[PDB]
Amino acid sequence: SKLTVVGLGYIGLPTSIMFAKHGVDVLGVDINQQTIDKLQNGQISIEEPGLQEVYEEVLSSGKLKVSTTPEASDVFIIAVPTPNNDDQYRSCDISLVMRALDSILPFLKKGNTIIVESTIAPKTMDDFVKPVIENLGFTIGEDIYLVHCPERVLPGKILEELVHNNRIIGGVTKACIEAGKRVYRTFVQGEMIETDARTAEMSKLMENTYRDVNIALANELTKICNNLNINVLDVIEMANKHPRVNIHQPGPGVGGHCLAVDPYFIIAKDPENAKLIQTGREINNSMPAYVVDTTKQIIKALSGNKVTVFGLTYKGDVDDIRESPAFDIYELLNQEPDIEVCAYDPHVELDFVEHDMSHAVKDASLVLILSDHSEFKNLSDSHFDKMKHKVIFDTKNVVKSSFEDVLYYNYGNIFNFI
Amino acid sequence: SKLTVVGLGYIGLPTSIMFAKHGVDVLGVDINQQTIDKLQNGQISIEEPGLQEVYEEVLSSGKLKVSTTPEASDVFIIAVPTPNNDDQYRSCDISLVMRALDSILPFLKKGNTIIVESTIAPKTMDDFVKPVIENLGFTIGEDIYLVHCPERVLPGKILEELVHNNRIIGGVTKACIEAGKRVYRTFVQGEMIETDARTAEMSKLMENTYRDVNIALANELTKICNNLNINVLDVIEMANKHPRVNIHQPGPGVGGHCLAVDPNAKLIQTGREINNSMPAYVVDTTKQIIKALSGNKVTVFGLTYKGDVDDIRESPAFDIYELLNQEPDIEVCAYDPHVELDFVEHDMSHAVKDASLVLILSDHSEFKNLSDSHFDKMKHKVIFDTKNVVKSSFEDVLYYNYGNIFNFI
Ligand SMILES: NC(=O)c1ccc[n+]([C@@H]2O[C@H](COP(=O)([O-])OP(=O)(O)OC[C@H]3O[C@@H](n4cnc5c(N)ncnc54)[C@H](O)[C@@H]3O)[C@@H](O)[C@H]2O)c1
Ligand SMILES: NC(=O)c1ccc[n+]([C@@H]2O[C@H](COP(=O)([O-])OP(=O)(O)OC[C@H]3O[C@@H](n4cnc5c(N)ncnc54)[C@H](O)[C@@H]3O)[C@@H](O)[C@H]2O)c1
Ligand SMILES: O=C(O)c1cccc(C(=O)O)n1
Ligand SMILES: O=C(O)c1cccc(C(=O)O)n1
Ligand SMILES: O=C(O)c1cccc(C(=O)O)n1
Ligand SMILES: O=C(O)c1cccc(C(=O)O)n1
Ligand SMILES: O=C(O)c1cccc(C(=O)O)n1
Ligand SMILES: O=C(O)c1cccc(C(=O)O)n1
Ligand SMILES: [Eu+2]
Ligand SMILES: [Eu+2]
């Protein structure tokens, strides 16, 4: 009957709004007072079209109340962030999840369900959540239910995505699985995949890992192809004609998300068993410097120091500068003497970011494309008129419009310039 | 028209037979006299089902002649081996390809086509083959045509695949591509992908690389999952529900093949190192199963890399068998219906008679539907399936795979 959502960001706030929309009494919990003040003043703390309207209905119905403190509840959902650890492997930091678990503990009653929606390293539910709960007068699958249901939201379609997506319900016990289904049954029309907590954890991280290792492969191949005057993009397209070959696209590096590596067991106790993952991460981490070295060479062959960075985010059409290879390049270029850097991103609202394109491209020798923003797809020679040299090095292969005055380069043909 | 095929193995001999079957005058060239004597006596030097029959027709028609020496021809196809160098990568050795090229050079005439079917590192056609030919006065795309046409056939289906498989025609010039198409149009019904030589070389290296790195990922994940008491197979099936996630299947290793790089490539190297470590990982797991049980006898099921194929070359399954054979305190016995050898035991029942563990290393069709009746002679009815091939559910036999071996310990 009552649900507490701990963490009111991109995951937690729409989720709280969703259960409250279906008649559940929801208490939204966040440690950020600025967030709580915004919410208590009737405004959503996140940027999502149409959500403000839904929030207004739900706030007025008295179904969604907010606080900096948890309170007694039937269901608790942890949707706090899992920052990236300062380590090679890029392990998920479970510290905010454990801090959030400790806020919930004094309010725990028999029959309660704890759902962890945040990204967690494999064996977190079993080896970290379970011992803490069992330390209190509790038995998992009997007194309380422990579910890991990984939450992943599609921006622009968050609420629809929350209803129609297939969902993984990872219970510690078979009883926990049933408790998880009970919770989501409220609005989830999508399929509910039943499994244990460790399988749910491992699976989501394996998705991230397949993607990282494959991007590392593409990036490593780009370096090889550039050395041999081979077009990497044409060869990936060629090789992918094999039904079981799916080579990924290269880029300026990898950001956001964390991998299938627990900080302890497979780093501190058996690291040679995560050798491929480590190598993949090393290759992806080296791409900002590879882009910078390529930039330095373009700027050497041309008159000028001005490089205009286009995009400071990892994903396109997102305002997230957090753990961004595009920002890493900008900062390296800024640090670098003999290079005058100017960032352009329509999605990024920072002070230092140039808001106008024409002003940003003004007297620049090179336009550096580091994000695949929709705006960058349809760019004509008209946009680059103010440049000292009309040259583009696109690390994302986003520009789909052909030019004449402007010299356009990919990872596929950058070797032609040098 | 006349064609010379240099190197008469699994690639060259069927290719020789194929062009001659279509009316081309073919000279098969091989440096091995034993091979030439076998061929000249009327017998194929290679093991492939109905090939002997097609060889007999073609030899009698006078369309396929063999020799240890090349002779003047319109087309030359190099199908010699590219052995593994030593080398931390076990990179492709281009030496036999270059030697084959050197043996053809004195016979070269204006208008000739040189096709390299052998595995070659990117830029071989452009930086190694082209300079040698141009040194003779020949102009590529004008008086000599240079093509890389990587050949890849499935044993048992060799002649069928030569016709029906799609083909990459990698010409040094656009004229070279046209010359390559005229050669293969003789019998190729499959699609002919037109591209330049460097794209054909790189594309072949990228296919094997995507495959190896991904198998390495699956195998590395299996080691991680086993350490955390997580089922790897269930997790791959779970994760692969994502439309852009295609995690491969783990196994006992990969059928060894040279890396077509010129002797950073750090990821590629690591991937091959992980796959090479799988035979020892399987052996270490086997040693632990045999420790917990009474007995020394382990029955290997499958000695081939590919299921339902005579794939014993650089086979990980075969490598495990020999490691188990070498290992004292372990009595190994191999069972494979597809492989005929001096050590391949009496048809199943006698191979299991007092064994404490059945180790499945190949995904043969026969291994899918398997009753308890088959293992009725074993000292301990236990199965460790490194391929996840057994689909027939059974009682009294303890079935283990990569996903649950941590349960036995
Ligand atoms: N956004 C996604 O679709 C996405 C995708 C995959 C995984 N995830 C997982 O979910 C996590 C959170 O995602 P998000 O985008 O909503 O992050 P977010 O930063 O937008 O929101 C997190 C919120 O939780 C609050 N918070 C932090 N610690 C707290 C605590 N101890 N108690 C109560 N509130 C606390 C923060 O103040 C912030 O408002 C991610 O870090 C990841 O683990 C998110
Ligand atoms: N078998 C395949 O489908 C496969 C797959 C991918 C690539 N390849 C490439 O093709 C190569 C050959 O494959 P294979 O399986 O036919 O090898 P193979 O060993 O079966 O046949 C090679 C034959 O060439 C002969 N030979 C060696 N050097 C020669 C020379 N200098 N002049 C004339 N003849 C010579 C050898 O005596 C041998 O008979 C491989 O090493 C690899 O480069 C083969
Ligand atoms: O299935 C996906 O890849 C996915 C799903 C939701 C959000 C995102 C994302 O934000 O990248 N990605
Ligand atoms: O969590 C994700 O969004 C994810 C994981 C692997 C691949 C992809 C993808 O291709 O979008 N996305
Ligand atoms: O459409 C998507 O789901 C998407 C697109 C780009 C990146 C990702 C990702 O990283 O998950 N996901
Ligand atoms: O497309 C493939 O994977 C393939 C094609 C032909 C032969 C072989 C083989 O012999 O392994 N593999
Ligand atoms: O050479 C091959 O047989 C090959 C190369 C890449 C992928 C695959 C495959 O998925 O079978 N096979
Ligand atoms: O049927 C095939 O092509 C096949 C089967 C198993 C392995 C491979 C491979 O490694 O290419 N290819
Ligand atoms: Eu995605
Ligand atoms: Eu294959």
CA A150 – ligand 4 centroid, Å: 13
How far is the C-alpha of B362 from the C-alpha of B233, rounded, in Å? 17
State how far the alpha carbon of B181 is from the alpha carbons of B174, B184, B193, B203, in Å: 11, 5, 9, 19
The reply to whether A386 belongs to the active site is: no
Q: What's the one-letter identity of residue B141?
A: G
- Say whether A290 counts as a known binding-site residue: no
Q: Is A224 on the interface with B (CB under 8 A)?
A: yes
Q: Is A247 on the interface with B (CB under 8 A)?
A: yes
Query: Which among B322, B340, B342, B341 has a CA at the least distance from the CA of B332?
Result: B322
Q: What's the one-letter identity of residue B53?
A: E
Tokens of A397: 């292969």
**Marked catalytic residue, from A63, A204, A390, A396:** A204
Quick check: A78 and A99 in contact, CB under 8 A? Answer: no
Give the three-state DSSP class for B224.
Answer: helix
State how far the alpha carbon of B282 is from the alpha carbons of B217, B227, B296, in Å: 16, 15, 16
Query: Which among B57, B71, B47, B65 has a CA at the least distance from the CA of B21?
Result: B57
Question: Looking up tokens 């093949």, which residue turns up?
Answer: B257
Going through A188-284 in order, the beta strands assigned E by DSSP cover 192-196
Between the CA atoms of A280, A284, A290 and A291, what dihedral angle is there, to the nearest 10 degrees?
Answer: 150
How far is the C-alpha of B151 from the C-alpha of B9, rounded, in Å? 12
Quick check: A14 and A58 in contact, CB under 8 A? Answer: no
Tell how far CA B300 is from the center of its chain. 21
How far is the C-alpha of B27 from the C-alpha of B406, rounded, in Å? 57
Query: Which among A164, A201, A154, A193 has a CA at the least distance from the CA of A177?
Result: A193
The H or E element that residue A99 is part of is helix A95-104
CA B308 – ligand 10 centroid, Å: 14
- CB nearest to A206's CB, from B206, B213, B235: B235
Going through B126-222 in order, the beta strands assigned E by DSSP cover 144-148, 167-171, 192-196
Burial of A342 (0-12, 13-18, 19+ CB in 10 A): buried
Q: Which technique was used to obtain these atomic coordinates?
A: X-ray
Tokens of A417: 């310039």
How far is the C-alpha of A223 from the C-alpha of A47, rounded, in Å? 38
Going through A93-190 in order, the beta strands assigned E by DSSP cover 113-116, 145-148, 167-171
Q: What's the one-letter identity of residue B132?
A: V
Q: What's the one-letter identity of residue B308?
A: D
How far is the C-alpha of A79 from the C-alpha of A103, rounded, in Å? 13
Question: Looking up tokens 């490598």, which residue turns up?
Answer: B319
Chain breaks in chain B (C to N over 2.5 A) after: 263
Contact A199 B235 (CB under 8 A): yes
Contacts of B202 in chain A (CB under 8 A): 225, 228, 230, 235, 238-239
Provide the pairing of β-strand B144-148 with B167-171. antiparallel
Burial of B153 (0-12, 13-18, 19+ CB in 10 A): middle
Classify the C-alpha dihedral A399-A401-A406-A407 as positive or negative. Answer: positive
Q: Is B228 on the interface with A (CB under 8 A)?
A: yes
Which residues sit opposite A66 in a β-bridge?
Answer: A28
User: Could you give the strand order of the β-sheet that contains B398-401, starting from the edge strand earlier in sequence?
Assistant: B331-335, B297-301, B357-360, B382-385, B398-401
Tell how far CA A343 is from the center of its chain. 21
Contacts of B229 in chain A (CB under 8 A): 198
Burial of A200 (0-12, 13-18, 19+ CB in 10 A): buried
Tokens of A127: 């080896």
* Cβ neighbours around A384 below 10 Å, total: 21
Quick check: A157 and A164 in contact, CB under 8 A? Answer: no
Resolution given for this structure, in angstroms: 2.5
Contacts of A277 in chain B (CB under 8 A): 220
> Tell me, what DSSP letter sits at residue B404?
T
State how far the alpha carbon of B323 is from the alpha carbons of A184, B294, B316, B405, in Å: 52, 20, 10, 20
Quick check: A281 and A89 in contact, CB under 8 A? Answer: yes
How far is the C-alpha of A277 from the C-alpha of A122, rounded, in Å? 15
Which residues sit opposite B2 in a β-bridge?
Answer: B25
Which of A231, A245, A413 to probe the B interface (max B CBs under 10 A)?
Answer: A245
State how far the alpha carbon of B256 is from the alpha carbons of A195, B273, B318, in Å: 37, 11, 12
Secondary structure of A339-377 as H, E, C letters = CEEEEECCCCCCCCCECCHHHHHCCCCEEEECCCCHHHC
- CB nearest to A207's CB, from B195, B199, B239: B239
> Tell me, what DSSP letter sits at residue B118?
S
How far is the C-alpha of A312 from the C-alpha of A371, rounded, in Å? 7
Phi, psi of A190 (to 5 degrees): -70, 170
Tokens of A52: 């403000």
Quick check: A13 and A44 in contact, CB under 8 A? Answer: yes
Quick check: A256 and A322 in contact, CB under 8 A? Answer: yes
CA B210 – ligand 6 centroid, Å: 14
* Cβ neighbours around B68 below 10 Å, total: 12
Quick check: A80 and A100 in contact, CB under 8 A? Answer: yes
The H or E element that residue B98 is part of is helix B95-104
- CB nearest to A274's CB, from B210, B224, B234: B224
Quick check: B25 and B2 in contact, CB under 8 A? Answer: yes
Crossing angle (nearest 10°) for helices A275-301 and B266-292: 180
Which residues sit opposite B115 in a β-bridge?
Answer: B77, B147
Give me the total of CB pairs closer than 8 Å, taking one residue from chain A and one from chain B. Answer: 151
> Tell me, what DSSP letter sits at residue A83?
P
- Say whether A68 counts as a known binding-site residue: no
**Cα atoms in the Cβ-side hemisphere of radius 13 Å centred on B254:** 25
Quick check: B367 and B360 in contact, CB under 8 A? Answer: yes
Give the three-state DSSP class for A314.
Answer: coil
Phi, psi of A132 (to 5 degrees): -65, -45
The H or E element that residue A56 is part of is helix A51-60
* Cβ neighbours around A352 below 10 Å, total: 11
Crossing angle (nearest 10°) for helices B316-326 and B266-292: 50
Which of A88, A194, A233, A238 to probe the B interface (max B CBs under 10 A)?
Answer: A238
Question: Which domains does chain B possess?
Answer: 1-196 (3.40.50.720), 230-409 (3.40.50.720)
Tokens of A100: 């959030």
State how far the alpha carbon of B406 is from the alpha carbons of A194, A266, B229, B279, B401, in Å: 22, 16, 6, 18, 9
State how far the alpha carbon of A60 is from the alpha carbons of A25, A48, A52, A187, A208, in Å: 13, 19, 12, 20, 39
Q: Is A195 on the interface with B (CB under 8 A)?
A: yes
How far is the C-alpha of B311 from the C-alpha of B158, rounded, in Å? 13
Contacts of A210 in chain B (CB under 8 A): 214, 217, 239, 245-247
Which residues, other chains included, contact A39 with Cβ-Cβ below 8 Å and sequence gap of 6+?
A: A8, A13, A28, A30, A45, A66
- Say whether B173 counts as a known binding-site residue: no
How far is the C-alpha of A143 from the C-alpha of A150, rounded, in Å? 23
Contact B210 A245 (CB under 8 A): yes
The reply to whether B258 belongs to the active site is: yes
